[PDB]
Amino acid sequence: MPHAFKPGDLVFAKMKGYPHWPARIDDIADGAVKPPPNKYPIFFFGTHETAFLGPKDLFPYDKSKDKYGKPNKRKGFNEGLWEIQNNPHASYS
Numbered sequence: 001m002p003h004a005f006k007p008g009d010l011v012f013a014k015m016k017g018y019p020h021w022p023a024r025i026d027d028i029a030d031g032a033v034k035p036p037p038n039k040y041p042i043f044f045f046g047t048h049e050t051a052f053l054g055p056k057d058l059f060p061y062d063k064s065k066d067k068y069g070k071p072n073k074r075k076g077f078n079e080g081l082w083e084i085q086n087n088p089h090a091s092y093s
């Protein structure tokens, strides 16, 4: 059975106006801004932007890749696919 989400988990993350997007649950660095309660720090592959989202917007990568892991016109999307598939745990500083 599923656990709760944890840092390092790989997902497709959905925001209003954008396709399901390759992403990871980030850690919070010591001394860094924490998210609101009930929200996770989401790092989006390709764009390298962060947002705070709840589970309703988070689709586990393994289960969803066949639906969602297809090239897309949007800026950074295809880079994002390479990253989630090829080095999803790296520093994208």
Ligand SMILES: CC(=O)N(C)c1cccnc1
Binding pocket: 015, 018, 021, 044, 047, 048, 049, 050, 051
């Ligand atoms: C892919 C991407 O970067 N998206 C969807 C985003 C992330 C954070 C804020 N707005 C949009």
